Amino acid sequence: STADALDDENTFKILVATDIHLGFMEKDAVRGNDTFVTLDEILRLAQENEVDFILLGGDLFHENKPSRKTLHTCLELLRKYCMGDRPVQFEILSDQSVNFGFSKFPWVNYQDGNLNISIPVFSIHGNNDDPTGADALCALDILSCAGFVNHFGRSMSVEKIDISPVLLQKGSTKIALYGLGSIPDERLYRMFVNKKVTMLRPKEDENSWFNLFVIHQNRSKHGSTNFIPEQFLDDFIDLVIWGHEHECKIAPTKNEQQLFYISQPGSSVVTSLSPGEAVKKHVGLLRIKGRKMNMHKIPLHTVRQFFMEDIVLANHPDIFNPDNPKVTQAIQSFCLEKIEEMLENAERERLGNSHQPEKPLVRLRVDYSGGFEPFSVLRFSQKFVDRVANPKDIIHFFR
Amino acid sequence: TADALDDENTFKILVATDIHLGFMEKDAVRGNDTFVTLDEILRLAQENEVDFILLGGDLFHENKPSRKTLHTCLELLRKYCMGDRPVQFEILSDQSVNFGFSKFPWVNYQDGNLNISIPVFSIHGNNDDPTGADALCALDILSCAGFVNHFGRSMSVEKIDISPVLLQKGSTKIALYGLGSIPDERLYRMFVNKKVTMLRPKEDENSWFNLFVIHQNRSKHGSTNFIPEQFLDDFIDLVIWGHEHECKIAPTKNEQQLFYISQPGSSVVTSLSPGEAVKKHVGLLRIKGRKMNMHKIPLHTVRQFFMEDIVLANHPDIFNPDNPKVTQAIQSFCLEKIEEMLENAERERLGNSHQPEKPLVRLRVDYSGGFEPFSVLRFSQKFVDRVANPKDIIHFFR
Amino acid sequence: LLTEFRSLVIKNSTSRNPSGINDDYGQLKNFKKFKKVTYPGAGKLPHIIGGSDLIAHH
């Protein structure tokens, strides 16, 4: 196939994922293992595809201080899979000490003489797990010091930021990885306004560096400076891994104004019941050869399914009549039918996937505008306690 | 004699306990002492080509260590444990029985992925005992990391089977029995009910040096709030009692049970007690055949602790309860005593640069006999920049 | 396009020599530096003393 030919000694095979939010709802009885099993699946896919390395978009741990079980499970999984014997066929040309200065072992993990790294893990600290405390440490620091994850993209200075790259070379192909750890949106917006953000580029073979950038910042505009416009970034950046946005648009998209592509891998777990969360989760395998690139999205078979539907009562005057005394009963009947259809679709999809969780997540958003009255969500949900993972959140009323 | 003992058939074990890593971390003066001491002990290990360290437990002071504590512990263990030094002894027991609760049930160094040069064996002390539905403890985190082999776990609470780990090097062999910390009353009741058992190897039964580590209270603090030594069987050769912080690392023969007991004691002064006063040490325990040799090594980084009790009633000539100035005379005498303490501290420090600058002091005063205590803060103000624990230099009691 | 340019290729007075491993295919490209060291009994059937081999002390 074309992909097989594209897989050569000069082709990078970068696996891309983000917002694992490991340990999310760990204490939950039903969803407890969702994050762990998803991490298992993603790492297993990384191993099977024989990926050159992993590039996680951040938020690796859901909590800023990961709980003991979470850390133990993550560490055992990493040791089980990413430690191995398969050769690594790419080399570092940058000043490692500069990239990983905050670590007392300033060199890439697989270059450690004492650890048998097979699948190096690169990441950038996300908002939920940014360095904190007077010491300014984070969970990724724990893993890195342990010698599993190469934590890069740290910001030495708050007044000014010099985003240095790590130069990865595999055969005739070269990559400049520019990572910018999660920073509060207002502050980073202001720094960009004040021309306080600078990106170093290699003077050597300037045009021969596929400039790969990663960031963990809001993509949509929720405020005057409560986001990051794409217009800020420059056109020399080839590909951008926008990570923080949980909704998935993994397909690369070209910015005509800026002439660079933007990829939004999205979350690996449905942290919230929002329309963006509903899109099927995926993890991107990025291939880089010369100045070109290609992204292939891979489905996850363990991500617990989320189905959402928005129903507007006022758009069904024939079905719903507010003057009708029994309008509430008809509303309940139609909602029940819709939820039955959603569960039918969920089971149909699950039939082909053994590992998939049995109880999917469902939320019905009801616009009761026009005088329609919400009914007892609890009593209605009583009937699906054993069918769905959010029995207390099956419906949502809003106006 | 030590050089002759140091043979291919001789083990070289470094024993320490109650590291209580990270305790009082946030403090400005003693905050970094724990890490400095841990670095010192690890460096001593790496300098004396120790075959393996056997931490007596409590490797983390706080049940859930702080991010900084865990980070620095991993840093030091990485810097001083991983290397190219070959491990020259062999496992002979069934490994999965001992480290079964780990998804990689084998001694860390036997894993192919990690270049361990100095293996670390330990048990779980009281402060870091497994907790939560998952029954995991910081030492389990380090184990998963592949740095410290957490052995001696007990699966059941109703019955305990202390399966030994069998270690051989050349001709010499050791049976290591690790019984993790248990609530004292529960363990006492189990001993009374004959639920405790220590498996032994049928092969060369008398050729195995039975070494048994335990972390439990030694002195009688209650009816069943301690572990009488008589409970152990005479077949045990050497016992490393861990919990008690008084350092008594000199091996002692118990005439009744015919087993030696050595108490390494804590490596840091956690509390102000007379037992803490004694200078700390780390034992380079050596084993050859059935004979053993323990040689202490002082620590140059344990914050100095000087303690003295003063009975005012024992100095009637100096102090008279009827004297209105008695308070001032007592204060002057206390100042003189503290000055002498500081003089001795500096005198001993002069010989080791690494030692912490601000010594600790705690002066117990028995003010019985109608005497009254004076202000502690006002008196201590004069040394706020001279002692490491200025807020509690003096103790009044009766 | 143009931005701050800095010579980043890490080449000292003597350029860094990449690490390698025995050439499995052609000239194998490996840059790892891990070699697990041997321990006694390596490659040997383990002489395990477990199960019935152990006896409770009476």
Ligand SMILES: [Mn+2]
């Ligand atoms: Mn996130």
Ligand SMILES: [Mn+2]
């Ligand atoms: Mn985020």
Ligand SMILES: [Mn+2]
């Ligand atoms: Mn202790």
Ligand SMILES: [Mn+2]
């Ligand atoms: Mn203790």
